[PDB]
Design a protein around this ligand. Structure first.
Ligand code: KRS
Ligand code: KRS
Ligand code: LYS
Ligand code: LYS
Lengths: 484, 486
């Protein structure tokens, strides 16, 4: 263990003393492992192309029992593997002693090979080296397959080398974001970048990160959302605009919460709640189909040990009104204002009666949220669904519902009880922005005329979790935030 | 003045009291203004399509009347403009008094218009309103084009700059086109985009004061990344042989025409590539990028501002390479012997600075003295064409691999446009033993010990690049919301 590293450390030094460079600068390779497999997978068993010289690189992930002049290795690159069949007959003895050269090779070593393509008699696609150079050695002992804990998160490179599902998961993540970008781009949307650091931190309910700028001698807040600046751009005449980037929220960590996570928000001039619902249904249905050739996926809601559930992404999705639903599953009528002494105490009695835990503070919005979490947000697990028409007290930036007083034109989409999407008709009457009478800069922009707008936010990481069958957000983030 | 705002606000309340919503929820439009223009630009003079009804929205930018029966407006949307020609005879009198309705409209007002397309007698493409409704009023007096440029207003109220200045939209459209081109450029070449952490327990790899922040639940101080180099290399170790990231990095340093505390960088790492592959890539990219945008490899750039003479910048490859140490020796007619770390060579450089009246880097480390030299004697060598400064000394380049024939040096390359660095690339140091700073955190070092293949890496200053290709002299001009003092 500690000895292995010391030996390899010595070996590197010993090689240098012998004038050999264990870390050469440039090895010009002529073909990639995936390319190699594609161009030679259909060779006949035992067939050799001994005249076709190739330069190929990879990482040795398996060394076979040294035979009498016959050495076998597994070589991996870009998530694919071919066999290394070193044969004494084909060895270039000008470059060095056969057995001595390959006896040096250890598992994990990155090597560059000069050889020709062919299959073994058994029909295994292989590269036959005439020469093998060491490009970069592995000084530690790699875990065996199925051998790899918190190591996955702290040493992600080891996860990517050993666990095949790892590369697939993060490839899917990029495919997801790519798809999202093209989806918004194909429909006339314009991607921008707003500031990570601001004098204030809206628009969402979350404790911010605070940092300090030295030469300006200024205390800056890390953005918790992108909503405000993007809406100012709508005012600026960018009628379809969006941003895919990191946002920072200074709260608790768990399976669905990571301090910094990727979000996408777009704002869509002259669109509304109804446009937004249709968009959501269009996007998720098409996205899931694009990844799986079907609108149905399997997801292990209760973990890999328990039976998975099926999630049907076939549109349309159910819409559930938050207040009405709570009233219906409670046989109660929550009379407005929701923050009245009568209604608050009535919500509290529901929370005590049903054995639910009381929020703190016991504000109207907090109570409504807790009631929703218990009586609604798990109503459907077999398909996405929207909770809609949130009260204004929960939605300080959502435009008032056009027929339901006290409510707003807002929609959250849930997958297996987890919020992945938040959208509403943007409040654009500056007079109704009670806080403005938020950021001064934002408030002022409204006064110049925000047209009728629809805004939407996506939780990218959580969406990745569901489409990569993960129970934790740590599985869809390359370098999640870990306690040291 | 302020009386205008207060009157407008009062107007808003008065409309609310008379039973009308000055902020309606939804106006279902059927066509956009640019679509409108593209679909009827080839109409004939005086022609109408009076049975083709359209819903169209936009912002009123001009208001001219002619006898209380003809009202004229400029309607803009998506950076384009058409005329609004309101005629009493075409007006739908069931929706309200003609003169009254249009008397209420002010410059900046966003409106929804039900009407038909046509051209004026003079050939001005126009929407002919049968009905016009307020969607959202502008409560303030919108400045004219001379009320903005040039002030801080463009940087604090970017929305005003975007509405009134046509070039501003063009500028930020270009920025996005550039990032798109880069993403496609790398993606087409098999590169894999990823996201590495904004916050870490340490902050490498680069030479800059970091931002410091605190995580409350972990009870932990964290550093905003100054670069993305370390995590990406670790991913190379993970077998992601072509990886990259386009995002913000944070450097707590000084603010000027080429420095913003947060800025957008692109760093990629390319397994089994080296210094020469990097030079080729840089040349392929900038030439193709420039040509993609301009159909030519040559562009004009106002180095001294729009008031003074512009210069031409030829992005036709190849570009000049200049060895930093050898070049400094030539121009100063001195011989900087190694190690550069030595007191003797430090004394030489300090004297050259004294002799030439260059500001001393406090503190004057060898690396900073070298940089200050190259800055004063080399970095402005070429302005009419981009060029590389190469083969930086190892003491300037702790993560760059050593030069394979020139001792003390490394296989590194910085590219310059008008004396401003836009690119920093080099062959990566992959021998854990030669990274004596390991014997950056232990996470990165441990990873090198698992075998980093020979690799080339490169970093792009996206903002600065956007500056030169949008003809701007300040980075504040290519950032939507630049960092300002409150
Ligand atoms: C941008 C928003 C829209 C609603 C869904 C989703 C919620 C968001 C909240 C959130 C808070 C937090 O502290 C940590 C996190 O990882 C998340 C997240 O992933 O998802 O993204
Ligand atoms: C990623 C790097 C590679 C080299 C060029 C360029 C340099 C980088 C340095 C830098 C430092 C700083 O404090 C503020 C800034 O705005 C920049 C910048 O734009 O450019 O980008
Ligand atoms: N910024 C919101 C998402 C957009 C909601 C619609 N303006 C959030 O972080 O939840
Ligand atoms: N991290 C470097 C760019 C990459 C250099 C090559 N590894 C910088 O901030 O300039």
């Amino acid at each position: 263990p500690r000895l292995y590293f010391e030996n390899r450390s010595k070996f590197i030094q010993d090689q240098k003393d012998k004038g050999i460079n264990p870390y050469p600068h440039k090895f010009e390779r002529t073909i990639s492992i995936p390319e190699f497999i594609e161009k030679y997978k259909d060779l006949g068993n035992g067939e050799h192309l001994e005249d076709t010289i190739l330069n190929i690189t990879g990482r040795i992930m398996r060394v076979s029992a040294s035979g009498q002049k016959l050495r076998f290795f597994d070589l991996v690159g870009d998530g694919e593997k071919i066999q290394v069949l070193a044969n004494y007959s084909f060895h270039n003895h000008e470059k060095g002693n056969f057995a001595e050269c390959y006896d040096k090779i250890r598992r994990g070593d990155i090597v560059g090979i000069v050889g020709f393509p062919g299959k073994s008699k058994k029909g295994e696609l292989s590269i036959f080296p005439k020469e093998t150079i060491l490009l970069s050695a592995c000084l530690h002992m790699l875990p065996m397959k199925y051998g790899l804990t918190e190591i996955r998160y702290r040493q992600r490179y080891l996860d990517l080398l050993i666990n095949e599902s790892s590369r697939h998961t993060f490839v899917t993540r990029t495919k997801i974001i790519n798809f999202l970008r093209n989806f918004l781009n194909e429909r006339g949307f314009f991607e921008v970048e707003t500031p990570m650091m601001n004098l204030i931190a809206g628009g969402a309910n979350a404790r911010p990160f605070i940092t300090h700028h030295n030469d300006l001698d200024l205390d800056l807040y890390l953005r918790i959302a992108t909503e405000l600046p993007l809406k100012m751009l709508i005012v600026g005449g960018i009628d379809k605009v969006y941003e895919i980037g990191k946002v920072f929220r200074n709260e608790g960590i768990d399976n669905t919460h990571n301090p910094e996570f990727t979000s996408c928000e777009f704002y869509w001039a002259y669109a509304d709640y109804n446009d937004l619902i249709k968009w959501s249904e269009d996007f998720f249905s098409q996205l899931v189909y694009h990844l799986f050739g079907t609108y149905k996926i399997s997801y292990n809601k209760d973990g890999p040990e328990n039976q998975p559930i099926e999630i049907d992404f076939t549109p349309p999705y159910p819409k559930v009104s938050i207040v009405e639903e709570i009233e219906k599953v409670t046989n109660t009528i929550l009379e407005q204002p929701f923050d009245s002494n009568e209604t608050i105490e009535k919500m509290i009695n529901i929370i005590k009666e049903h054995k639910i835990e009381l929020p703190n503070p016991p504000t109207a919005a907090k109570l409504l949220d807790q009631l929703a979490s218990h009586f609604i947000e798990n109503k459907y697990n077999d398909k996405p669904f929207f909770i809609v028409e949130h009260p204004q007290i929960m939605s300080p930036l959502a435009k008032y519902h056009r027929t339901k007083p006290g409510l707003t034109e807002r929609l959250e989409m849930f997958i297996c009880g987890k919020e992945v999407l938040n959208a509403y008709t943007e409040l654009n009457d500056p007079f109704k922005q009670k806080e403005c009478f938020l950021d001064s800069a934002f408030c002022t922009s409204l006064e110049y005329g925000l047209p009728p707008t629809g805004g939407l936010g996506l939780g990218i990481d959580r969406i990745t979790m569901f489409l990569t069958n993960k129970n934790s957000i740590k599985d869809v983030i390359l370098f999640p935030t870990m306690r040291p």
